[PDB]
Amino acid sequence: RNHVLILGWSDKLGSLLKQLAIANKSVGGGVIVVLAEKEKEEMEMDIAKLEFDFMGTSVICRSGSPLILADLKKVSVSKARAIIVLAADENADQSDARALRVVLSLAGVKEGLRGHVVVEMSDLDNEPLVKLVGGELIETVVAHDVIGRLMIQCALQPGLAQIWEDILGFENAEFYIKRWPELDDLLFKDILISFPDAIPCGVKVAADGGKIVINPDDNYVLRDGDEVLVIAEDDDTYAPGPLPEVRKGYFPRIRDPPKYPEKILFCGWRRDIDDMIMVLEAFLAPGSELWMFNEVPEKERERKLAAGELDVFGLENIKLVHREGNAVIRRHLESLPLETFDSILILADESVEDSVAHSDSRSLATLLLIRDIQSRRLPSIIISEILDSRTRNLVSVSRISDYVLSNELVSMALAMVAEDKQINRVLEELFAEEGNEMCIKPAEFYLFDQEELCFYDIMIRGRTRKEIVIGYRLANQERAIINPSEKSVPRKWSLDDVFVVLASG
Numbered sequence: 001r002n003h004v005l006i007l008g009w010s011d012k013l014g015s016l017l018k019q020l021a022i023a024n025k026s027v028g029g030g031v032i033v034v035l036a037e038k039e040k041e042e043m044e045m046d047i048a049k050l051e052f053d054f055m056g057t058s059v060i061c062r063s064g065s066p067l068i069l070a071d072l073k074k075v076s077v078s079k080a081r082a083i084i085v086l087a088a089d090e091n092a093d094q095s096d097a098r099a100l101r102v103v104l105s106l107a108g109v110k111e112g113l114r115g116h117v118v119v120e121m122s123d124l125d126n127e128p129l130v131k132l133v134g135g136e137l138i139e140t141v142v143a144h145d146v147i148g149r150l151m152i153q154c155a156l157q158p159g160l161a162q163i164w165e166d167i168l169g170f171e172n173a174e175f176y177i178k179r180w181p182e183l184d185d186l187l188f189k190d191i192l193i194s195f196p197d198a199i200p201c202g203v204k205v206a207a208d209g210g211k212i213v214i215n216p217d218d219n220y221v222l223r224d225g226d227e228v229l230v231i232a233e234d235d236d237t238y239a240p241g242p243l244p245e246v247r248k249g250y251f252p253r254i255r256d257p258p259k260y261p262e263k264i265l266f267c268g269w270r271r272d273i274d275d276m277i278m279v280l281e282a283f284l285a286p287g288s289e290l291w292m293f294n295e296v297p298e299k300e301r302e303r304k305l306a307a308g309e310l311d312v313f314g315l316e317n318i319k320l321v322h323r324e325g326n327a328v329i330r331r332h333l334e335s336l337p338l339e340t341f342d343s344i345l346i347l348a349d350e351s352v353e354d355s356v357a358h359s360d361s362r363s364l365a366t367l368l369l370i371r372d373i374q375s376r377r378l379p380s381i382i383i384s385e386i387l388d389s390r391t392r393n394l395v396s397v398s399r400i401s402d403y404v405l406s407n408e409l410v411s412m413a414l415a416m417v418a419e420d421k422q423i424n425r426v427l428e429e430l431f432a433e434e435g436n437e438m439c440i441k442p443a444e445f446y447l448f449d450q451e452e453l454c455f456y457d458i459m460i461r462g463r464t465r466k467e468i469v470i471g472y473r474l475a476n477q478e479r480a481i482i483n484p485s486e487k488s489v490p491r492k493w494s495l496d497d498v499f500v501v502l503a504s505g
Contacts, residue, residue, distance in 0.1 A: 001080075002079065002080075002081040003030060003076070003079070003080055004080065005033050005035065005077060005084070006034045006084045006086055007102055008086030009038050009043065009086065011089060011388060011389070011390070012411045013034065014046075014411075015411035017032060018052050019415035021052070021057040022055075022171060023415065023419055024055075025234070026234045026235055026236050027056075029056015030057050031058045031059075031060060033059075033060045034061050035062050035064055035066050035071065035072070035075050036063070037064070038063060039063055040061055040062065043061035066085070067101060067102060067105055068105075069105055077106065077113070078109060078111040080115050081114060082115045082118065082418040083115055083116070083117045083118070084120070085118070085120065087122055089356045090354060090355060092122035092271065092353070092354075093122070096121060096127075099130065100130055103130055103134045104133060107135075116137050116139065118139050118417045118421070118424075119134075119140050120143050121140050121141065121142035121143065121145075122142070122144050125308075127142050141413055143407070143410040145272070145275060146409075146431065147385060147387075147405055147407075147409070149279055149431035149432075150405060150409065151383050151385060151405060152280055152345075154403055155345055155383045156262075156283055156343070157440050158381050158400050158403075159401075159440055159498075160438060162403075163471075163480050164438070165412075166480075166482055167482060168409060168412045168413065168416065170412075172233070173231045173233050174231070174234075175230075175231065176230055176234075176235050177204060177420055177422060178235070183222050184222055185222060186222050187222075188218050188222070189460075189463065190243050191222065192218075192463070193244060194240040194243060195230060195232075195238055195239070196487060197483075198230035198231065198237075199231045199232075199468070199469075199471075200230045200468075201215070201229045201230060201468055202214040202228075202229035203226050203229065204226055204227035204229065207225075210227075210422075212422055214229070214429055214436045215436050229426070231470050231471075231482060245456075247460075249461035251461050254444065254465075260285065261317075262285070262343065263288065264280065264288070264290050264342065264345065265291050265336070265338075266290065266293065266294070267327050267347055267363075268293075268294050268347040269296050269347070269350055270349065273292075273308075273347070274309060277310055277320075280318060281316075281317045285317065286317050288318045289321055290318040290319070290321065291322075291336075291341070292321070293324075293325065293327060293332075295324065328366055330369050333369055338373055338374060339374075342380065344381065344382050344383070345383050345385075346366050346382070360386045360388055360391055367382070367404070370382060380401075381401045383405065385405050386404050392408070437504065439500075440500055442495070442499075443493055443494065443497040443499060446462065446469075447493050450492055450493070450494065452491065453491070454488050454491075456488060457490075458472075458493075458499065459487075465503075469499050470483060471500040473497070473498050474497055480498075
């Protein structure tokens with residue numbers, strides 16, 4: 001039936017169905033089948049209590065266990081085009097132990113599998129086991145670990161929050177990989193601009209086995225079998241064409257400036273924080289401070305950090321500064337130099353996490369308090385982890401530089417991978433210190449003040465500093481425009497503009 005089969009019920013499910021509906025708009029809708037241990041009505045009642053426009057896409061609910069193979073046939077596991085195993089919202093170890101066992105039964109389906117498996121993981125220390133049972137059928141999406149890497153990136157560059165929501169959603173633009181033989185033997189310098197309604201980001205190199213190469217070589221020749229990667233609005237609004245006029249791009253060197261180290265506040269002891277310190281110390285300049293305000297004693301923090309793979313003496317960029325106290329008590333919060341923090345991350349604590357209903361609630365208190373303090377004390381980026389998206393919307397006050405992350409973005413992630421498994425290996429690098437990553441860079445490097453240039457100029461000028469310009473945010477527009485549509489119309493640019501690029505250090 002070539003459908004999408006979801007195995008499990010949670011709160012990410014509602015937003016997961018939303019994102020599947022948006023991608024299926026360009027097909028006239030599809031069918032989604034949910035297989036959970038809830039009663040049919042209970043699942044169907046919640047389905048109808050969703051006011052987003054389904055838009056051609058049907059949702060079918062069934063009661064059963066994704067451990068019994070006999071139930072996997074009522075919903076046609078062997079005929080599903082994509083099989084998602086939803087994690088749960090309680091014990092991270094219990095949830096991952098379930099996901100492993102669903103993965104077992106799927107690999108044992110003697111009828112074979114038409115599609116692939118997308119598994120939502122909880123503890124990252126438990127993912128390398130599942131990439132060992134199912135193997136190739138499987139793409140792992142460690143939600144808890146992903147939520148972390150997003151917070152760090154957005155905490156280092158604001159506005160990236162709003163941008164990481166456009167892209168990572170099927171609203172606006174997203175990622176696609178198609179094969180264009182018309183550009184066989186064409187130089188990437190040329191393929192970069194061959195698209196009026198896209199922005200080529202990478203290539204799927206056939207000689208390597210299909211490896212996806214973000215930001216490749218401009219002399220690299222498209223061989224027989226390659227597939228391009230672009231940021232386009234849907235899987236049918238992008239196609240190549242002819243190389244346009246070289247709106248002239250010869251901007252000079254313009255070397256990048258030094259690296260001021262930053263001071264970061266981690267609020268609360270999230271589970272597996274060592275994973276975030278590792279990501280953080282890669283990004284930050286030498287000389288930085290990472291302050292950790294939580295309730296755990298400073299003496300036993302080093303035991304939990306040691307037992308999580310982290311080498312604190314192996315740390316060299318950041319110096320851990322440990323402080324103790326309750327993060328929902330203002331008396332404790334105001335003692336901190338809440339002025340001298342380049343950015344503050346409110347983490348969901350691991351003690352409260354094993355019943356989410358309480359877990360966000362302290363982050364909520366922690367959030368509103370840090371806000372009122374930053375105003376009350378008067379004569380910083382604030383990024384908060386509130387897992388429930390329902391609670392996020394009431395509190396969002398997104399502004400910019402006060403972004404609160406929700407599990408809607410894990411749904412936004414699972415949907416991306418459940419539509420093209422190779423995109424997971426794209427998001428993997430972009431969340432990774434290694435290689436490329438999404439930056440916001442000023443217009444100083446790219447042009448002079450009041451320069452009259454099309455987008456192809458700027459998109460080609462980005463090639464001399466080895467970057468992929470994927471959009472912009474003009475001087476006084478709330479939102480950044482990713483993949484603009486009028487690319488060959490020149491316009492008067494200014495030094496207060498900024499460009500969304502695909503750079504790498």
